[PDB]
A paper describes a structure:
C-di-GMP is a near-ubiquitous bacterial second messenger responsible for the coordination of a variety of cellular processes and behaviour, including motility, biofilm formation, virulence and cell cycle progression. DGCs catalyse the condensation of two molecules of GTP to yield the twofold symmetric c-di-GMP product. DgcR from Leptospira biflexa is a constitutively dimeric prototype of this class of diguanylate cyclases. Here, we show by biophysical and crystallographic analyses that DgcR is a constitutive dimer that changes coiled-coil geometry and domain arrangement upon pseudo-phosphorylation.
Hereby, dimeric c-di-GMP mutually cross-links a RxxD motif (primary I-site, Ip) on one GGDEF domain with a secondary I-site (Is) on the other GGDEF domain and vice-versa. The crystal structure of DgcR obtained in presence of c-di-GMP (DgcR_inh) was determined to 3.3 Å by molecular replacement and is shown in Fig. 8a. There are three symmetric dimers in the asymmetric unit. Each dimer shows a Rec stalk in native conformation and the two GGDEF domains have their active sites facing outwards. Dimeric c-di-GMP is cross-linking the domains by interacting with the R206xxD209 motif of one subunit and R163* from α0’ of the other subunit. Owing to symmetry, there are two isologous cross-links within the DGC dimer. Comparison with the PleD/c-di-GMP complex shows very similar binding, but with PleD providing an additional arginine (R390) to the Ip-site. The DgcR equivalent (R237) is too distant to interact, but this may happen with the Rec stalk in the activated conformation. Indeed, it has been noted earlier that among GGDEF sequences arginines are enriched at either position. The unique c-di-GMP stabilised GGDEF arrangement that differs drastically from DgcR’ again demonstrates the large flexibility provided by the inter-domain hinge.
Author numbering:
A (entry chain A), B (entry chain B): 6 to 298
């Protein structure tokens, strides 16, 4: 629906700007990269037109500077460039552009690339607004568990059952990743998920919930038993010997809030979440490797 | 990893064929469109290069002739054309091409489009290799529901709960489809799913299970109650006025087996299925529009 144009030159920028808004689209102008970021966060930006040559960085650090800025952490970025060279295309795609236009842009080759992007965007939008299984961990994703909670809660609240929910978080993940590699970052998330899978009952509802976030539902289980068993894992994880990108041993831990059990005084399913969260906050806020309830 | 090239001319085709397999890829040659289809079905084809000008059709019927042929019903198709004209791009994208390449093809602008496609393919592949709801109906899919049943069963068997499972089937679907169109076929499946969604509890686990198959789980529900409510729907569906091909009113019905309730005598979760099926058999075998248990 909504396109953001980055171009240092006012005339080149306002030409694109018209081609866009002529075809029922919403033009959004950016002087250079400062302004562009204040829009990406500020508004619901579908597609990005990026002059390779901006008043700060040359294209190929400039690309991933918009990727990082995005809410979902990916926008479709069309290169509007005067670069021509074969290997400038293959650099731009390599660096995570969605498309490449060689200036001068023709109106009806552009509109076709904007369509081609809006297509490949709705794909990213599904994968992140629906119940998929996360390939990496083998656990379901988060909008799964959002749905699954409200089911499992409504069931347990109608049929006077115990329902206890955990909310887990890997301790200083940003750091593990930044220090050992996006590779080892991933390698840990896996090894944690593996412990979670092995530790409980097929009846229990494990799920990845965010970057390093996880969520467990323990139907028919009370807050203390939930804590007891979750804590027992937290320990075994603590004691787990991982290898660094040097083949150095290192350990990692998670913080946990658990919440629910009874449910008489919990009305919303969204309240049962608020609690698990407040409790994960304290868990971290108090030196991390520990469960709170 | 595996690219299929359609070009009438042997020399143009085997030039592309080398550019491809030079970059660690798998070239697959097609004389014209007959041969190409015998490959799409025959093998795991990632990406398609399509000469616009082939010995039978002009590009724009030729495109959707490959779309239909695909197992998943969509491949990324890159247009190799000598057409230049603005509105030939805008036709090709409109008609469901993934990209447009202007002959003569340059090695290193091609390889960039093939990469751009393999990316937008792996996105389609995620959404369909992990992704638990059926698109069409918005219900849980089958691979999920097989897993979900064994969970919900193991839960109910551990915690002495009632668990009743339905298995539904639209009556003489083949006929509805053959008479009114693959269009109206689809349109009914939807309308049934919608009734199923509206009729029960958030707690209940509805799922599309095959062409015209559906499955419901009624946790905490006994075989009779399951039957009563499932039968109440079967009725309202019966009374539903659908519109044909022609805007003719027509009605449709479903057959149902329900099974479980107690679970003391049922060991496998796969047995709880066998029963629902045997009962759907009788339901149909005895003049269809009816539940059996
Ligand atoms: N969601 C969930 N809750 C868990 C899990 N492990 C323990 N709990 C909770 O903790 C309680 C006590 O566990 P326990 O003392 O070993 O008490 C258990 C234990 O001795 C045994 N038990 C139950 N299920 C199993 C099982 O699958 N394997 C084994 N080896 N023993 C089991 O029977 C006792 C019955 O206690 P319960 O009524 O199950 O009550 C359980 C349950 O409320 C788990 O993996 N998932
Ligand atoms: N300490 C403790 N551990 C628990 C408890 N619940 C589950 N676990 C652990 O989690 C594993 C998975 O149990 P499950 O998936 O419910 O599936 C279980 C369950 O369906 C059945 N089973 C085993 N022991 C019991 C039991 O005491 N009661 C019941 N009702 N089923 C059991 O056998 C399966 C595998 O048994 P395990 O090899 O023992 O494997 C169990 C056990 O190692 C619990 O309450 N306490
Ligand atoms: N999974 C599932 N099971 C179902 C459903 N409808 C009925 N049952 C089962 O069959 C019984 C029939 O409920 P009812 O005769 O409609 O009589 C119901 C009805 O008058 C009322 N009631 C129950 N659930 C609801 C509800 O969700 N909404 C409203 N408005 N009333 C409800 O309270 C009575 C108590 O019924 P129960 O003790 O629950 O016992 C229910 C339960 O055993 C359903 O849609 N899904
Ligand atoms: N006769 C009958 N109809 C059923 C039954 N189960 C589901 N339905 C129908 O489908 C809806 C199911 O609501 P829910 O998801 O169970 O979730 C329930 C629950 O959260 C609450 N609710 C409504 N009635 C009851 C009830 O009797 N007991 C409890 N515990 N909650 C109820 O409101 C929701 C549905 O409110 P409704 O407007 O009535 O909407 C109900 C109702 O018209 C059933 O057993 N019997
Ligand atoms: Mg400029
Ligand atoms: Mg030719």
């Amino acid at each position: 629906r909504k396109i953001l144009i980055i171009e240092d030159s006012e005339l080149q920028r306002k030409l694109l700007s018209r081609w866009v808004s002529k075809n029922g689209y919403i033009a959004i102008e950016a002087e250079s990269i400062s302004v562009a970021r204040e829009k990406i966060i500020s508004e619901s930006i579908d597609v990005v037109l990026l002059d390779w040559e901006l008043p700060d960085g040359n294209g190929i650090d400039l690309i991933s500077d918009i990727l990082s800025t995005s809410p979902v952490g990916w926008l479709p970025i069309i290169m509007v460039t005067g670069h021509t060279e074969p290997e400038y295309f293959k650099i731009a795609i390599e660096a995570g552009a969605t498309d490449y236009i060689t200036k001068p842009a023709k109106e009806i080759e552009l509109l076709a690339r904007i369509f081609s992007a809006l297509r490949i965007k709705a794909l990213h939008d599904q994968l992140r607004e629906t119940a998929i299984r996360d390939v990496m961990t083998g656990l379901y994703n988060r909008r799964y568990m959002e749905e699954r909670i409200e089911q499992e809660f409504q069931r347990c609240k109608r049929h006077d059952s115990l329902l206890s929910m955990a909310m887990i978080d890997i301790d200083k993940f940003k750091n593990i990743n930044d220090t050992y590699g996006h590779e080892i970052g991933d390698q840990v998330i896996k090894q944690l998920a593996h412990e979670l899978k092995t530790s409980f009952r097929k009846s229990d509802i494990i799920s990845r919930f965010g970057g390093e976030e996880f969520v467990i539902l323990f139907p028919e289980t009370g807050v203390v038993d939930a804590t007891r068993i979750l804590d027992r894992v937290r320990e075994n994880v603590s004691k787990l010997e991982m290898k660094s990108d040097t083949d150095q041993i290192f350990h990692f831990t998670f913080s946990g809030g658990v919440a629910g059990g009874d449910l008489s005084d919990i009305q919303s399913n969204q309240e049962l979440l608020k609690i698990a969260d407040k409790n994960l906050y304290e868990a971290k806020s108090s030196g991390r490797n520990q469960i709170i309830s």
